[PDB]
Amino acid sequence: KILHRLLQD
Amino acid sequence: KILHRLLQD
Amino acid sequence: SLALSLTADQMVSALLDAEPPILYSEYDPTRPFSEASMMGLLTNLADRELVHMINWAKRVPGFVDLTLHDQVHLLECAWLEILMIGLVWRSMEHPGKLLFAPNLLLDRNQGKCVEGMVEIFDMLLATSSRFRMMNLQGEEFVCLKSIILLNSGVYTFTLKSLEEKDHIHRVLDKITDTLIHLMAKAGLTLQQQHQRLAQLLLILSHIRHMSNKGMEHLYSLSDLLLEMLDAHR
Amino acid sequence: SLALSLTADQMVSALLDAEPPILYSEYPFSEASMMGLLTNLADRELVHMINWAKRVPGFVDLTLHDQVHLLECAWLEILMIGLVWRSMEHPGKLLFAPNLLLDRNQGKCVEGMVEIFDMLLATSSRFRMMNLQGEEFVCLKSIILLNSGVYTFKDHIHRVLDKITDTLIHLMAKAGLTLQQQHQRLAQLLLILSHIRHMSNKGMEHLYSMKCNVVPLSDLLLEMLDAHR
Ligand SMILES: O=S(=O)(Oc1cccc(Br)c1)[C@@H]1C[C@@H]2O[C@H]1C(c1ccc(O)cc1)=C2c1ccc(O)cc1
Ligand SMILES: O=S(=O)(Oc1cccc(Br)c1)[C@@H]1C[C@@H]2O[C@H]1C(c1ccc(O)cc1)=C2c1ccc(O)cc1
């Protein structure tokens, strides 16, 4: 999900 | 209110 | 005002003396079970507990100084939080179980018998475990429970009344002093006392969360519980 | 974890430095426009919150899973304390943004919002009457992040929370408060957190209804919402 992505970026 | 009553006893 | 003149030890004595008894369920272990029955049990128990809670609240230092209106509001806001902290307290010495009553000890598996109760059961168990890990003392417990009563509805309430908010805040500060007093007596260092105080108060946020979630599920009943639930709508 | 080794002053400066910016609203209100503005704003704020969270000492030490869980649990509480913080100097008003300062009247055009607006105003007033300092605010907001989901899963988070407690007391002692005043203020601040939790639960309840159309929420807001549903 989007949160996963935003947390690594 | 029942609650009101009981508080009043 | 007698609450303000109370010493810490007197505060503790008063709170301990005012403790409600532990009620029994109507649980019949010979009988199967079901969403219907279990919820009948828990509803019947809570209803009887509410009666004792109302009379316990009258003995919480400072509570009787409030208007009847305010007393009603506080109990309407805090009743489930208070049932919950009481539940988690008596469940401390029963890892993995919730001691609703001496004759009603449930595990999460049985909490599945009611749709959506299992998630809340897990939170209650986690809270009990947290209390057990922290080795919460009876004296600390009674302070916490009183704090819930006075705090949960204080921001949910005539200008003049504002002195009503203020009296509550003074009593709350007294209970804080009391908690610190207990910890210092227990041999905790200053750093330890502040840390423990914080840990205990942060748990109250989780108790509010659980109550909110339960209330949501509840209003989705006895005459008193109905009136209490409607309060949250 | 690097967090535990930090001094109180280092903790504070780290927190102050991680602070997210104040965002602007888009350039009377209905029900669709109110929701539109707030939803749009909250959405942009979420992106900054996620990057702020990465900079809360200790947060980076958690698995990605635990980070997701904490943020999913706390996001609305975090928006709310931010809102009440910047609304302090505006008694009776909620400063959602510099160009969007509202009172309870506007809260009415959205069913069920006036009640929460009133709770927010009361919280702001409480913070103001208490003279809450920026350094205390950032500690509280960090506490909300680490605490709110801690029991929804742990020793690390608890040690970090202790450090923040140490920092709060450190800020109060430096502000000149007596010992009794230090513990009373600590309790006062932490109890307010229970009210912020209450506001979030109520608001969330509305939000994952009102997802049931009004405005087409973002996939991100939706996923943040769905986590509570
Ligand atoms: O948080 S909940 O599980 O609320 C729910 C209530 C009903 C259905 C569902 Br799902 C959830 C709540 C907490 C505990 O178990 C549920 C419940 C309960 C309370 C009143 C009722 O009339 C029925 C049940 C509990 C309870 C807790 C402590 C008590 O001393 C007594 C009861
Ligand atoms: O607690 S609420 O009022 O939740 C509601 C949201 C929509 C309708 C209703 Br009723 C309630 C909440 C708090 C404040 O106002 C509601 C809201 C909001 C958040 C996300 C959205 O997508 C829409 C609105 C608020 C908000 C608070 C702080 C922000 O920095 C930004 C937004």
Tokens of C58: 């009258």
How many contacts does B have with C, using Cβ atoms within 8 A? 25
Q: Token match 């475990």: residue?
A: C129
- Asked if residue D163 lies in contact with residue D11, where contact means CB atoms within 8 angstroms, the answer is yes
The answer to whether the CB atoms of C75 and B2 lie below 8 A apart is: no
| D181 CA to centre of own chain | 25
Chain C: nearest CA to B5, how far in angstroms? Answer: 10
**Residue whose CA lies nearest to ligand 2 atom number 6:** D207
Q: What angle do CA C35, C38, C44 make, to 5 degrees?
A: 130
The answer to whether the CB atoms of D220 and A3 lie below 8 A apart is: yes
Per-residue three-class SS string for chain C: CCCCCCCHHHHHHHHHHCCCCCCCCCCCCCCCCCHHHHHHHHHHHHHHHHHHHHHHHCCCCCHHHCCHHHHHHHHHHHHHHHHHHHHHHHCCCCCCEEEEECCEEEECCHHHHCCCHHHHHHHHHHHHHHHHHHCCCHHHHHHHHHHHHHHCCCCCCCCCCHHHHHHHHHHHHHHHHHHHHHHHHCCCCHHHHHHHHHHHHHHHHHHHHHHHHHHHHHCCCCHHHHHHHHCCC
Return the closest-CA partner of residue C218 out of C125, C118, C116. Answer: C116
β-bridge mates for residue C105, sequence order? C99
Per-residue exposure over C13-35, b if at least 16 CB sit within 10 Å of its own CB, e if not: ebbeebebeebebebeeeeeeee
| C158 CA to centre of own chain | 29
The answer to whether the CB atoms of A6 and D68 lie below 8 A apart is: no
Q: Considering CB atoms only, which of D50, D219, D224 is closest to A7? A: D50
Helices vs. strands in chain B: H and E counts, helices first: 1, 0
Contacts of D187 (CB under 8 A, 6+ apart): C172, C173, C176, C179, C197, C201
Look at the alpha carbons of C102, C104, C105, C108 in this order and tell me if their dihedral is positive or negative. Answer: negative
Return the closest-CA partner of residue D60 out of D132, D119, D142, D131. Answer: D142
- Asked if residue C216 lies in contact with residue C116, where contact means CB atoms within 8 angstroms, the answer is no
Residue D65: burial class (beta carbons within 10 Å; 0-12, 13-18, 19+): exposed
Q: Token match 């942060």: residue?
A: C202
Residue type, C121: F
C221 CA → ligand 2 middle, Å: 32
Residue D96, phi then psi, degrees to nearest 5: -65, -40
Return the closest-CA partner of residue D143 out of D189, D202, D94. Answer: D189
CB D73 near ligand 2, within 6 Å = no
β-bridge mates for residue D94, sequence order? D102
Residue C56, phi then psi, degrees to nearest 5: -70, -40
Fold entry, domain C1-233: Retinoid X Receptor (1.10.565)
Instruction: Domain ranges for chain D, please list them.
Output: 1-229
C193 CA → ligand 1 middle, Å: 33
- At the second CATH level, the architecture of D1-229 is Orthogonal Bundle (1.10)
Asked if C216 is an interface residue toward chain D (Cβ–Cβ < 8 A), one would say yes
Q: CA C47, CA C125: separation in Å to the nearest integer?
A: 22
Resolution in A: 1.9
Return the closest-CA partner of residue D187 out of C201, C179, C166. Answer: C201
